[PDB]
């Protein structure tokens, strides 16, 4: 008995942590020379301790916790418990979702304001009537999403699935088609009892999410509202960057027997050695070597599995369709090392102090979102590193064309666009920011063979039609699909952890069910249902 | 008309070149500004240096569903008549060669759910195991999709023939639907099908998408599904391609524009700003900053893709709030192509692992594997040196998004991974072993139009609501009437040359209407009375 774990991201590392706690031998096979996957911290050459940024995961909306690292029940309790398990609870530092001093900026339709100032951003000229403006995007979206989200939250608290059944009755909607064809405003709003026009729906998307978000599944909008805590959370980040979490797990696993890492070994084939024999082991071809396992837990992204030879893994027809159709979404980030944290200490072209500490600014310009660092802000050397752009969906697709070209001329075009946008958002001259620029690092998760997308971002119907097929094993029960796509917390670490819980659960169920009581005791009786 | 009229045309793609052709025909001065060192834009022919005359492939436009034409190049009315008459205007009508949409010999292959068949053999591709009932299988995807799309498409075709807009107005009443949401919430099968009068399940809709289009197509606007059915001719056409590759068309236009020795293009000059010199002056000229130089024009016709305009400083172009939203929200789609030079046209002369001849000449094969579509060359097939070059993969939507991560990485290890995946997929589709194809491989060229700064996407592919809400705003000029938006996005023929041409007609029409209406009769006579409405 020995489990092959494919991928040393947080899903594979957590699977390994569970198996080691239950004395199950395993091996982790990793294509690259690094552990952590989409926990990827870039530290700028020649910068200080806090001159890094997180290219992937960077913020954790955790439940409240006590002095000992005991977490209240909640959506991300499993992440919190993982930090505590590893002795990391005291290395968690505040993440400021909003600025800890003056509010961040909003810059839309050429109108600049602070978050909370109640600007309408010229929406009357767009044809948004004053009644809608007075209610506001947040309240409108909450009225539509809230009923679904409350039922799913009740499922988690009460250990039911009726909320999910109702969500699936509505899973053929995109957020857009929900607003266009089903949603009617609460009568308390005093609005006409008719579906919103596309102009109004596009106004909602502009201020609620990212360009194109509303054409993906309604269910994803509901689940992400739950994940972001809108249904209190302690926002945290990891001192030194998210890489500390996978590095800490790998260091622990390396100090112990029953396991080993196989690095720099890309998987090219997965299948039963002999599919007609009931006791057949699994074979994984990685780095040109055949390795044999009793069972395999894959944490490879679904589009990556589509590049692997799965002949003799005996996927059923729904599973093989799911690998292709279950939809992924794109994302880019651009980090800039400056000479000083000008957003904290500087002033705009008219002498007005920005006075920003952590938090975010938002704009309809191509950069879309700016994230000021929360790490290091009270130390003797605050971060000089900015997340100058963080984009999703169409905004990320478009920006990705300027990233990773290898050509100086496009690198210069990209820098000039980003600085020009930043200048407009903050009301500075371009040269103010250029004079302070040191170094630029950019990343496109949709131009990366190890991810082939940033993360799962399902279209309408995906959850109701294809998702469950991959929670069944393949390969006569010996191939288990995991990774964040196999969760209802897409684009979160907790999604990867939940998928690992379910894969090990199934593995134990079919091979050694006497270990189930200890598995439940250490890692929970359920993946998602609250403690 | 001011003595100093001069139109700045941004972009030397087919839209900008056609704009210049129209203006030249009307004696209106112009200048073309192009970021790159080449003309043609998304008409992009890659020639393999180690190959023969027909060892090229078209990385962008490659096939033209034209109306029937006579011996002199007069085209019947039809969706792509404007393209046909452009060929004839340029003396190219006789350089058009057949494009085989289906194989000219034995049928192409389909490989879905591990089941291989020839096109036309009636396989169900294991659909019963997917839960597709026998009634749906017997009807078939094509008939079902035609039943849903047909009424919209017929009303739009009537618009073109009868010179009305009621078909479009009715389409716009339904533009908030994606193809998926139309099937899930509105479409009911024709009574003649004998099916339950219920909306299709997601499982069934995903089966339609699998065989009809590309992964994720149905989450874009229903209107695009209708418009592309019109464009592909499912509402007959002469499929043509250009001998030597699509590059011949823009090359021929450039040569025509240069024939008097003038109309020098401004090359290697990327536009970074467009705006009025003084937006508070009514007679203000336009200023274009390109290659670090300011250039002044009376009017500007932009053929830059919308995501490109979002990287240009449009301060002082005075876009209204709808137009500036449109630049961001009007959706683009991705595409990739992979061309492979082989030692021989094994698809024509070779045999599979059981000795069965492929016997393919032109045409296409289809699969749910990552490569999705294989296109066999139609050019050169009857000559003494047929093409040895294959389009081994041509993908859209999610399939293109995923494959793009393996393209242009700059890393030998990923180039090798890509080649092995493509050859493995080809072997499964055609029933060969991998080594059969590897033994015949010479060179690989791959291209991702969604990782290309000059396009920032393959082409417009609007989401639901885009046409009804935002499209018309960019058909109005900006910059006090002096900035005209064009390029294929500004059409109802997205991802076709005719869309770029229509957009150029409309931009020049508006320019003439506001600056020199005495040229309208000659403009109509040479280039048509309407952009789209049919004429003899
Ligand atoms: C831009 C962005 C932003 C965020 C986030 C992601 C991204 C991309 N997330 C989500 C979070 O990062 C993500 O859900 C998990 O890290 C995914 O972990 P997995 O183990 O599922 O996959 P992951 O992709 O991390 O790991 C897979 C592993 O497989 C390897 N591999 C790939 N192909 C292989 C092959 N052929 N053979 C062998 N190995 C192969 C890879 O190299 C990698 O190590 C997040 N979460 C959160 O909690 N807070 C946040 O703020 C964010 N924000
Ligand atoms: C993969 C694929 C496949 C097909 C097609 C496209 C693609 C991508 N098409 C569609 C067809 O190729 C397309 O609609 C037109 O060529 C677009 O012409 P435009 O002039 O609108 O833009 P196009 O993008 O061609 O031209 C714009 C020009 O602007 C330049 N430029 C960009 N940024 C600039 C800047 N900042 N400053 C200055 N210049 C700048 C570019 O370099 C380019 O020359 C097609 N059509 C068809 O009829 N049949 C087919 O078979 C196909 N198939
Ligand atoms: C499916 C999807 O796009 N989710 C986005 C939700 C947030 C992404 C990431 N966790 C963040 O905090 O930005
Ligand atoms: C908007 C869109 O995706 N259109 C696709 C239609 C066909 C693309 C191209 N003209 C071809 O012939 O492949």
Swiss-Prot record, chain A:
L-glutamine binds at residues 59, 390. L-phenylalanine binds at residues 59, 390, 491. Optimum pH is 6.0 to 8.0. Its main location: secreted. Pfam families: Amino_oxidase (PF01593). This is L-amino-acid oxidase 4. FAD binds at residues 11, 30-31, 38, 58-59, 267, 484, 492-493. L-lysine binds at residues 59, 390. It is found in: Secreted. Changing residue 129 to A: Lowers the glycosylation rate of LAAO4, decreases greatly temperature stability, but does not affect the catalytic activity. Its cofactor is FAD. It comes from Hebeloma cylindrosporum. Catalyzes the oxidative deamination of L-amino acids with molecular oxygen to the corresponding alpha-keto acids and ammonia. L-glutamine shows the highest relative activity but LAAO4 has a broad substrate specificity, including L-amino acids with big aromatic, acidic and basic side chains. Methyl esters of these L-amino acids are also accepted, ethyl esters are converted but with lower activity, whereas D-Amino acids are not converted. Homodimer.
